[PDB]
Amino acid sequence: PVNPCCYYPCQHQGICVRFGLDRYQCDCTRTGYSGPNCTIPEIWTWLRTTLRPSPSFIHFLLTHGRWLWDFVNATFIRDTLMRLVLTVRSNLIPSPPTYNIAHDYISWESFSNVSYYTRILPSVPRDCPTPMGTKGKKQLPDAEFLSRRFLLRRKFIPDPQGTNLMFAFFAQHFTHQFFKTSGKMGPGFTKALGHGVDLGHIYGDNLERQYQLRLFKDGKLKYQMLNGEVYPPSVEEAPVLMHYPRGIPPQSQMAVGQEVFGLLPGLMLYATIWLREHNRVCDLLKAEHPTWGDEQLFQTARLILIGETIKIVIEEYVQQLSGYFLQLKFDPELLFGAQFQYRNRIAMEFNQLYHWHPLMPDSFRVGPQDYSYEQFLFNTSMLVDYGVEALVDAFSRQPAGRIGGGRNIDHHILHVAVDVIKESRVLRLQPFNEYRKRFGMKPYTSFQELTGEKEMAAELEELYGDIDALEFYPGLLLEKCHPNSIFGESMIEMGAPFSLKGLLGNPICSPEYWKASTFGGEVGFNLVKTATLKKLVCLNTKTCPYVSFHVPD
Amino acid sequence: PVNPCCYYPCQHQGICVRFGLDRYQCDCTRTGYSGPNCTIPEIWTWLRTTLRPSPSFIHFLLTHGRWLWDFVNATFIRDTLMRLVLTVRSNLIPSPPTYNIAHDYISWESFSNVSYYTRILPSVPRDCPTPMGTKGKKQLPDAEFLSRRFLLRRKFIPDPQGTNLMFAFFAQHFTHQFFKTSGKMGPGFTKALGHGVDLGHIYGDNLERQYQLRLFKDGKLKYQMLNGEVYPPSVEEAPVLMHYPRGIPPQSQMAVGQEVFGLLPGLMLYATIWLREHNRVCDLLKAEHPTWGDEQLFQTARLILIGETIKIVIEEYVQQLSGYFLQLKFDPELLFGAQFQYRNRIAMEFNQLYHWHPLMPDSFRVGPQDYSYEQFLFNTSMLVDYGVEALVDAFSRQPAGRIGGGRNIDHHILHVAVDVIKESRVLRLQPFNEYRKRFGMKPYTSFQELTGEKEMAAELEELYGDIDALEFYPGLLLEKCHPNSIFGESMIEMGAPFSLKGLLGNPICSPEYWKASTFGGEVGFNLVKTATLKKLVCLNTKTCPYVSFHVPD
């Protein structure tokens, strides 16, 4: 008999469980609901969901009326909201983590094995009629045509929010510390066992390699002087597995924490910058703490750097993305109010959703020059050629591709998207609509409602058969976007909760850790609290270029 | 200049941080105290401190009167106070963990590398005048001498609280899933990565081993029939690493989660009991969910068994230890409205502290027979000679040693305590009196004040020279004990916090994992909710013998 759970009977986060031959039962525990399917709301829950504004109304608010916000921001109401965002958003995320590619149920192996990604919804069961559960055609839409007809850029669409490539690369850099899928273990598994902001893209994902990159004098990282400027050393000087092409000089290969960073100067730029930062922070620390050995200098530098990273991403990166008039604020003290887990596990869903390749331009402009993809990719000298200042000026001046709304991925990298989808299908990821519901939205009733348009819609309608067969990742990228926006509500509402839980769940945000001691006292603590994209750059260079996550005017 | 931190100048959980060449300061963040040393109370601390009664008094409060208590046990107050104890206890233990053998400060490697035991107090700094700080003599007392004069059991001192061997062997069994110190990596590193109640000692601490122990059918572990009884498999059938006397026939080796267990019949008794429970639990699962595969059946029964353990540990084990009239309760829902991190990292001090070898008797009486050590140790046929029922009955009946009070370790195992102190000095554990302060107790001012009696104090008084020299382990075992207690206040007052954090800082007890579905429904959940030592044994044996953590009336 057909598998009942395959209908996803359990609403509102109830857990569908098989009993006897073909019965099921939903466990409605702590859902706010009861009944066979968790649809009968408790007194407080009914109260809640009717007095609750729709996500878009809230967004509208946060993005309109400067006059109210000028006010709010300068008063404490700035913090009440920040607290609210933090706790409400994060709540959507199970911690301790629930499921993994192997387990569709809570298990110890699931909980203790950090090589796995987690997931918020269970897989689509194998014993099921259609690969998306119950709805749609037998064999799913072709991955390659889907990317061609819908994600392949025709002409270039700059982000209407003015996001620059400075941002784009920072995202790529930043994220490739917690997304590193295992080649050898395959889909659903991960190298990045820090599972968040450990900065393992600077100090590597392992101790042994970490050790290889370290000077072991003064808490510092190894480095090479070139044209008077500091850079990550060569693989000959610091011998770690780096994914450069073969034949390429280990004498040209640069050594950073993330094996793939040698492949784009974008990444190699930030690896440079963060390295200078780290060494720079060591210099400061050794002035106040001369009695300190080498080890306590490195480990402290790393905290500060972890601290700095979270401060910026929150107060600048997410700001840019949100466009909110409310100024966001990094302050773990907001979270000492309520029940919070300073623990994070990366979901496969988060992975899928962060494949932000659209941001990537038709070509890369460095003042007068116009380097193509082939010219840019795997370049072994561009970084050293221009230096940091010059390549910060350039990335900060170039508009990035809008993410949502479709047809805005450059053909050079469209194969990523293809794989993401194909990868999605191996992972038996649930339908997009099933994820709407789980991230507190209504499901879309049609393809029209999704795209806010007819042509793509009715075209997808027939490829996919039903809208409840629409997949996660395609769905995120094809949904309509309010003009003036970088992407669609589902990206915000699905991503934000994975995003914030990933930032604040870090243990340096705990009552235990968030003290000055942790950061070698007050200069250490103040460095975290006042850290900036400008500062991070212009403190570590001879001159100071346009630095920002947005283009100038 | 001498390192200022050597003085432990900083009170009530402040952090001594070395600054410049010869100075220091204290980070007294969130301590409740201000000032350079941190002895200047905030309004709230003072009130809280002039009105807090002593441990003596609370111990007295729970250990005396019964009328009041059997009343309290029938009201909501049981839950009220139970919660007080948990929160009170577990808030003294940092979470995220703080330091380890290598780092005397918070660091990422210390957050991240679970192969370390954590530590509540930092190590006595390597640049200090005396091995214990500043107070005391150049040489700590000879460890073997300290043992032989103070801990060697002359006459057997039975536990005044009636503790039996059945408890003793339970304590060992249970505690040996989270203390697996490296023979290889050395002092202060762990093989048992669960850092808690994960039943590694049953399923092995690694995936390789677990697979080898698993029958991979119905979710069961392998077993063999000897005399019609289910015992753990042979090593030929489950080829895993087990420590056995070389020369012992392979058919006579039993394979279990934990490598040492095969030595002592005690151990291999519980290993057998639990194994039987596991398979038994699968036999209830498969009936409920015949569609379920062996992996789920396996991982679900595991959670039921982890749950069953804590239930028994809290409601029966820790209850027996306490002598409290407060009926202790395992109810995770008690913490559901509170800052509580559902994690735990094992500490050296817990390991040290948990060395209750003074539990073990002179001989081991089994029915008409009385067994010497040279007869009990490593006996491989004994468990299978008498069978579970007959051996449980015999451990339940024989008294266990009194733990505190001094001179209660049998000579046969006296070398253990010798290594404990030795290791204590490799781990540079701070002096007893500092651990006193960390756990919200007043330090001792005289060796006289410590033991109570006049004689044995004054010998130490001359061995150590000064009370602030006295060592962690020794102080524990030599401290005067409350009116008829199994050990002194310090053990209680230091142990329990770790103890409790060790049970309830377990994801299973989290809001996320504490639902019927985690255990495959009501049936599983009710076994957790309703388990008893008596039931863990008798539901698995032909007849039901005497079983209990206390010797009879």
Ligand SMILES: *[C@@H]1O[C@H](CO)[C@@H](O[C@@H]2O[C@H](CO)[C@@H](O[C@@H]3O[C@H](CO[C@@H]4O[C@H](CO[C@@H]5O[C@H](CO)[C@@H](O)[C@H](O)[C@@H]5O)[C@@H](O)[C@H](O)[C@@H]4O)[C@@H](O)[C@H](O)[C@@H]3O)[C@H](O)[C@H]2NC(C)=O)[C@H](O)[C@H]1NC(C)=O
């Ligand atoms: C949790 O924590 C445990 C404790 O840290 C970890 O186990 C330890 O892992 C480290 C891995 O490095 C071990 O550290 C030791 O370090 C010494 C240091 O001496 C250095 O040797 C280097 C050798 O490099 C040599 O030269 C070239 C270039 O320099 C190298 O590329 C080449 O490989 C060559 O051999 C020197 O470069 C350096 O100058 C020093 O002389 C090293 O010699 C030891 O062999 C050892 O590696 C440590 O011993 C491990 N275990 C223990 C008990 O300490 C554990 O890994 C961690 N767990 C996790 C999951 O991360």
Ligand code: HEM
């Ligand atoms: C020209 C620039 C870029 C290149 C060359 C590139 C290339 C790649 C490649 C080859 C992969 C592996 C996919 C596969 O083999 O199937 C990948 C994965 C990924 N990319 Fe990009 N990408 C670029 C831009 C970006 C940017 C700007 C982001 C930031 C949002 C991003 C986010 C990701 C993520 C999250 C993954 C998954 C990582 C993993 O699981 O290992 N990419 N990228």
Ligand code: HEM
């Ligand atoms: C006759 C029975 C016992 C014997 C033969 C025994 C002997 C030993 C031995 C040989 C060790 C290992 C020390 C080393 O690593 O060199 C040890 C450690 C230990 N014992 Fe026992 N002991 C017994 C009973 C107990 C009891 C009743 C307890 C209370 C729970 C206990 C608790 C511990 C603990 C916590 C360790 C340290 C384990 C680790 O660090 O991995 N032991 N004992």
Ligand SMILES: *[C@@H]1O[C@H](CO)[C@@H](O[C@@H]2O[C@H](CO)[C@@H](O)[C@H](O)[C@H]2NC(C)=O)[C@H](O)[C@H]1NC(C)=O
């Ligand atoms: C966590 O889970 C993975 C998946 O089970 C573990 O790896 C597999 O282990 C088995 C037995 O050791 C092998 O047959 C597989 O080939 C391994 N790899 C894969 C991709 O399945 C991994 O060992 C676990 N991690 C830890 C720390 O135990």
Ligand SMILES: *[C@@H]1O[C@H](CO)[C@@H](O[C@@H]2O[C@H](CO)[C@@H](O)[C@H](O)[C@H]2NC(C)=O)[C@H](O)[C@H]1NC(C)=O
């Ligand atoms: C890597 O980038 C460098 C520049 O940083 C490329 O060389 C430059 O090419 C431009 C024209 O595209 C010239 O105006 C400059 O004279 C060149 N600079 C140097 C130092 O040669 C180089 O071609 C790129 N690498 C690859 C493989 O295309």
Ligand SMILES: *[C@@H]1O[C@H](CO)[C@@H](O[C@@H]2O[C@H](CO)[C@@H](O)[C@H](O)[C@H]2NC(C)=O)[C@H](O)[C@H]1NC(C)=O
């Ligand atoms: C703060 O702690 C320090 C360190 O123990 C104390 O400073 C000592 O004070 C003595 C007199 O008691 C002086 O003679 C020494 O110079 C100090 N020693 C060190 C190592 O600094 C001080 O007493 C404490 N202050 C308070 C108010 O408790």
Ligand SMILES: CS(=O)(=O)Nc1ccc([N+](=O)[O-])cc1Oc1ccccc1
């Ligand atoms: C302030 S927040 O809710 O915590 N996050 C957030 C809010 C809005 C937007 N956005 O692009 O409008 C983007 C946001 O951040 C995201 C980051 C990654 C993925 C999704 C959202």
Ligand SMILES: CS(=O)(=O)Nc1ccc([N+](=O)[O-])cc1Oc1ccccc1
């Ligand atoms: C109820 S509790 O505070 O959580 N623990 C506890 C309390 C008292 C006693 N006791 O022997 O009176 C023993 C106790 O149990 C342990 C003491 C030390 C180590 C482990 C358990």
Ligand SMILES: CCCCCCCCO[C@@H]1O[C@H](CO)[C@@H](O)[C@H](O)[C@H]1O
């Ligand atoms: C009970 C909650 C009251 C708020 C109604 C929520 C639905 C409104 O919906 C929102 O309206 C905004 C109006 O300015 C539009 O700009 C948004 O796009 C739209 O989603």
Ligand SMILES: CCCCCCCCO[C@@H]1O[C@H](CO)[C@@H](O)[C@H](O)[C@H]1O
């Ligand atoms: C002007 C009001 C701003 C403060 C309210 C913070 C709400 C944070 O955003 C809320 O997060 C929830 C989790 O994704 C969503 O379900 C809500 O629709 C979303 O707006």
Ligand SMILES: *[C@@H]1O[C@H](CO)[C@@H](O)[C@H](O)[C@H]1NC(C)=O
């Ligand atoms: C619950 O959902 C199942 C499957 O979605 C459906 O068949 C059933 O009718 C529903 N029951 C109730 C009471 O709403």
Ligand SMILES: *[C@@H]1O[C@H](CO)[C@@H](O)[C@H](O)[C@H]1NC(C)=O
């Ligand atoms: C082991 O135990 C059995 C029965 O309990 C006993 O007869 C036998 O002699 C013992 N072996 C040793 C080596 O003491």
